[PDB]
């Protein structure tokens, strides 16, 4: 087509979605991790994660307001990944890299799994 | 902080939100324009428009599944702007610029109003 494009549009949209999350506006699901609860927007979770995409496209699960993750999932790893989903920023540290990679593998967040693999390979 | 950032994350999120819109997945509102109906996600509309932000933060309107726009709003202008919201791409043409600018002013989409004003000023 002959469209023009606003370079900062996608980033501004994500920033606003994160402001709605902060203020708990229109959040429609609670993700339960080892008795730690995280409120979020189903559409943002689906846009970022192959696991949430599969869950909320399921005719029965699409209607659930609570999703319980596998008990092996670490709440801090989930929190870091939820922050990444809403900001593009990943708080990756020596002390959390293993939990973050394991959580990204479970959530099916391929780009996160890739950078964790590379950061781990550099330390060996 | 000491975060790393994935450059294409925001764009990939918006692309996935647009794929959900195309497939009518988790859309939670119908916007009615001069008897033309557009299905969308409330959160994306709020992230892009000052008008939708005010509407869906209202305690009564946040619960509506149908929103009727002012009858002076042109459906094509709305369609072009809805596409922009989900893609960052604006189909701005000599034949639609006046309707697009009038719709962007009503929807409170300041960056769109700005480029329309500049494109109109260049033609005078």
């Amino acid at each position: 087509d002959s469209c023009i494009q606003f370079t900062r549009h996608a980033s501004d949209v994500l920033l606003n979605l994160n402001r709605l999350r902060s203020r708990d506006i229109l959040t429609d699901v609670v993700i339960v991790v080892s008795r730690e609860q995280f409120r979020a927007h189903k559409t943002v979770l689906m846009a970022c994660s192959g696991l949430f995409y599969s869950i909320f496209t399921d005719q029965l699960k699409c209607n659930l307001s609570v999703i319980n993750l596998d008990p092996e999932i670490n709440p801090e790893g989930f929190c870091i990944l939820l922050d990444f989903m809403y900001t593009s920023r990943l708080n990756l540290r020596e002390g959390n890299i293993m939990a973050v990679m394991a959580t990204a593998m479970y959530l099916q967040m391929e780009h996160v799994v890739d950078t964790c693999r590379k950061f781990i390979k550099a330390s060996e | 902080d000491s975060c790393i950032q994935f450059t294409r994350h925001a764009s990939d999120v918006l692309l996935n939100l647009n794929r959900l819109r195309s497939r009518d997945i988790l859309t939670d509102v119908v916007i009615v324009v001069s008897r033309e109906q557009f299905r969308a996600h409330k959160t994306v509309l709020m992230a892009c428009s000052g008008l939708f932000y005010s509407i869906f933060t209202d305690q009564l309107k946040c619960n509506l599944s149908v929103i009727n726009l002012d009858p002076e709003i042109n459906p094509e202008g709305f369609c072009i702007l809805l596409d922009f919201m989900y893609t960052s791409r604006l189909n701005l043409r000599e034949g639609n610029i006046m309707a697009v600018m009038a719709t962007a002013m009503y929807l409170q989409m300041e960056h769109v109003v700005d480029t329309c004003r500049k494109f109109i000023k260049a033609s005078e």
Partner: peptide, 4 residues
Amino acid sequence: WVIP
């Protein structure tokens, strides 16, 4: 704004 840019030409994409």
